[PDB]
Amino acid sequence: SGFRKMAFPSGKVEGCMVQVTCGTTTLNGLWLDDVVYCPRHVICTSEDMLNPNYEDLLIRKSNHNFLVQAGNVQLRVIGHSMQNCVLKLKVDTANPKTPKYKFVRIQPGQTFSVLACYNGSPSGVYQCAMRPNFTIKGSFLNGSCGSVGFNIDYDCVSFCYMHHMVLPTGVHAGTDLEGNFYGPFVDRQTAQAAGTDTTITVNVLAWLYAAVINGDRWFLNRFTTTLNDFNLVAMKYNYEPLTQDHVDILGPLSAQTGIAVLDMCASLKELLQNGMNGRTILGSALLEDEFTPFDVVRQCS
Amino acid sequence: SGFRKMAFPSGKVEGCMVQVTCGTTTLNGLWLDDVVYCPRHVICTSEDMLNPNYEDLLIRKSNHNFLVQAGNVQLRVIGHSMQNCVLKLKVDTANPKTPKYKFVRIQPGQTFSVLACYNGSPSGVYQCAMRPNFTIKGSFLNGSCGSVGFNIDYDCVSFCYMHHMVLPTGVHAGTDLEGNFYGPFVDRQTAQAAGTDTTITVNVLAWLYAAVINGDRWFLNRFTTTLNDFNLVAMKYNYEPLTQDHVDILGPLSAQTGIAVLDMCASLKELLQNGMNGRTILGSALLEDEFTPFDVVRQCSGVTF
Numbered sequence: 001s002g003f004r005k006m007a008f009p010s011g012k013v014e015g016c017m018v019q020v021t022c023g024t025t026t027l028n029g030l031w032l033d034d035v036v037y038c039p040r041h042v043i044c045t046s047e048d049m050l051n052p053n054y055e056d057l058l059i060r061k062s063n064h065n066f067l068v069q070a071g072n073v074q075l076r077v078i079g080h081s082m083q084n085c086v087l088k089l090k091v092d093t094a095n096p097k098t099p100k101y102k103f104v105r106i107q108p109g110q111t112f113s114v115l116a117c118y119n120g121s122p123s124g125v126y127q128c129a130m131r132p133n134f135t136i137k138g139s140f141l142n143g144s145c146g147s148v149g150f151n152i153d154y155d156c157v158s159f160c161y162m163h164h165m166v167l168p169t170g171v172h173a174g175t176d177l178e179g180n181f182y183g184p185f186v187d188r189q190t191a192q193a194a195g196t197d198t199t200i201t202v203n204v205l206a207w208l209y210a211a212v213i214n215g216d217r218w219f220l221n222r223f224t225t226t227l228n229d230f231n232l233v234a235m236k237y238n239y240e241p242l243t244q245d246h247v248d249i250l251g252p253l254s255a256q257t258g259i260a261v262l263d264m265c266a267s268l269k270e271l272l273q274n275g276m277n278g279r280t281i282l283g284s285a286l287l288e289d290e291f292t293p294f295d296v297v298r299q300c301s
Numbered sequence: 302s303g304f305r306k307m308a309f310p311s312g313k314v315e316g317c318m319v320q321v322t323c324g325t326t327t328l329n330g331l332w333l334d335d336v337v338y339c340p341r342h343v344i345c346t347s348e349d350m351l352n353p354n355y356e357d358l359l360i361r362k363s364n365h366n367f368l369v370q371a372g373n374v375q376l377r378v379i380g381h382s383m384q385n386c387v388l389k390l391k392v393d394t395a396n397p398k399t400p401k402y403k404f405v406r407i408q409p410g411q412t413f414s415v416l417a418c419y420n421g422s423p424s425g426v427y428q429c430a431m432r433p434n435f436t437i438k439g440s441f442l443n444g445s446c447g448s449v450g451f452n453i454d455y456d457c458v459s460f461c462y463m464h465h466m467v468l469p470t471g472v473h474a475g476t477d478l479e480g481n482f483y484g485p486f487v488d489r490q491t492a493q494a495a496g497t498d499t500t501i502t503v504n505v506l507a508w509l510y511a512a513v514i515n516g517d518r519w520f521l522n523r524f525t526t527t528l529n530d531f532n533l534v535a536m537k538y539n540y541e542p543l544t545q546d547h548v549d550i551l552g553p554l555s556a557q558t559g560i561a562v563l564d565m566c567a568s569l570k571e572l573l574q575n576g577m578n579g580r581t582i583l584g585s586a587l588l589e590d591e592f593t594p595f596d597v598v599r600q601c602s603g604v605t606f
């Protein structure tokens with residue numbers, strides 16, 4: 001039984017991580033079929049990081065300026081182009097370990113696993129979530145750029161994040177695998193900051209349902225609420241507003257437990273009002289918001 | 302920047318997981334060289350699990366009673382043996398994905414990654430600590446038995462755990478890969494209780510060091526304590542004793558942050574007697590104790606495998 005933050009097994013992604021070097025800059029690349037994807041700022045210099053002109057910098061490159069190492073093997077680059085903030089390096093060998101995969105852009109509240117890598121080698125795997133302010137709370141050091149976030153439902157890897165930068169509060173920003181940033185950020189070192197972050201309300205509700213499924217009922221009550229009254233209260237605690245779409249998505253969990261979604265919304269209002277009074281819920285003394293409805297069902301069933 | 306509960310990359314282990322079926326029972330096996338390891342209770346049936354005679358059950362089994370499936374391939378079992386609570390199945394072909402590895406037995410308070418599996422198929426990875434009462438706080442459903450726990454060192458996988466059962470409180474119990482149980486548990490279908498658990502003091506201190514390294518500094522204070530002074534208060538709060546080896550282990554972190562271990566113990570002493578007074582540490586309202594000192598050093602310096 002039990003309930004834990006769980007990442008996807010990382011092996012499918014480990015077989016795709018390579019090292020990419022251009023000049024003095026090394027980061028990680030993602031080798032799928034005969035294309036290596038990585039953040040375009042690997043072509044920057046140290047004088048050209050406030051206002052890089054990427055199209056100008058790329059034109060001055062040849063294939064042989066890019067050193068791509070897969071394990072102890074140099075891959076030969078035969079082409080290069082830029083798609084948004086992602087560089088695509090064509091190589092002369094399709095990766096034999098390429099899994100079934102697709103590229104997907106996720107919405108705020110969505111979770112995914114991150115394979116943190118340095119110098120093309122994996123360091124560790126963890127779980128996290130796209131925050132409402134389009135950042136993620138990762139664990140990343142110098143040289144982590146090009147690490148990716150992913151889901152594996154079925155035997156297919158969905159790549160949804162590539163790492164590009166750290167913001168002044170210590171949270172992180174990056175792109176989908178088509179190189180479009182999440183949020184308003186840009187890949188230069190001009191002043192940028194995360195907007196105020198909020199709690200992912202539908203995820204907290206999912207996690208309360210997970211608590212009921214595992215046998216906890218101490219936080220329930222006999223009250224219900226309207227959707228509108230719930231959001232008026234919730235937003236006073238910096239919670240994201242709950243939409244009718246979120247209510248629908250909670251239907252299965254609602255049905256499994258016999259607790260209406262608006263009844264569970266009433267429990268949450270009380271928890272925000274009272275705190276936990278020294279109790280814990282699923283091993284936590286805070287309300288957890290990085291489990292989706294879909295994660296809860298997958299881990300409980 | 303940032304700090305997360307982090308597992309080892311699981312790829313080397315994923316290549317070893319297979320499905321093992323005996324009669325009506327199906328669970329996971331670990332395929333290394335030409336031997337599959339899995340829990341011995343795979344040979345039980347309904348009536349048997351109440352009080353099994355595993356030797357008697359095993360002698361009645363032939364090789365062909367064991368269906369081992371590795372992805373889409375059936376593996377031919379040519380031998381079967383038992384070591385403690387682990388069944389070993391010799392197969393006719395070595396696993397070409399066998400990594401460098403060894404079997405190790407860990408100590409309570411040490412951490413490892415679990416690869417939860419169902420029908421030989423990896424489905425999730427998470428980081429666990431062996432608790433002082435020899436349970437682990439895992440997440441496992443029917444069919445999870447045979448999932449394994451491990452650490453990585455350079456390129457060597459150190460297998461330390463194989464999953465066998467769940468206890469009434471929802472925590473879990475298993476064996477090392479030589480089939481010796483962790484904790485005072487037996488592999489039969491009976492409710493068994495774990496002892497009262499305690500907090501892993503040296504890991505709490507490691508995590509406070511990770512907090513400081515990430516700029517979370519409000520719990521620091523001007524005071525220090527002594528081992529004997531601190532331990533007297535640790536006992537009171539169901540905290541493991543802090544030994545002299547624990548202090549030395551924390552040396553690197555202590556010298557990296559400028560906070561001597563006994564300075565940090567004074568901070569932890571206060572957190573125990575006074576609580577956190579509405580504040581959090583690394584996003585937690587509780588004192589986290591499932592990061593060892595090595596875990597904090599590895600994550601904060603970017604060690605790779």
Ligand SMILES: *[C@H](O)[C@H](C[C@@H]1CCNC1=O)NC(=O)[C@H](CC(C)C)NC(=O)OCc1ccccc1
Pocket residue numbers: 027041049140141142143144145146164165166167172186187188189302
């Ligand atoms: C690529 O590996 C790197 C990742 C940052 C570095 C430290 N931790 C991370 O997650 N990206 C950059 O250094 C990035 C490049 C720009 C062209 C976007 N700049 C960046 O993140 O600057 C802020 C910063 C850099 C170094 C230390 C602290 C903050």
Ligand SMILES: *[C@H](O)[C@H](C[C@@H]1CCNC1=O)NC(=O)[C@H](CC(C)C)NC(=O)OCc1ccccc1
Pocket residue numbers: 001328342345350441442443444445446447464465466467468473487488489490491
């Ligand atoms: C092996 O896959 C299984 C793991 C349990 C199943 C539920 N969650 C787990 O971690 N082990 C057992 O079921 C175990 C087998 C004995 C022969 C040692 N027995 C056990 O403790 O089962 C408790 C249970 C009760 C009701 C439903 C499911 C399990």
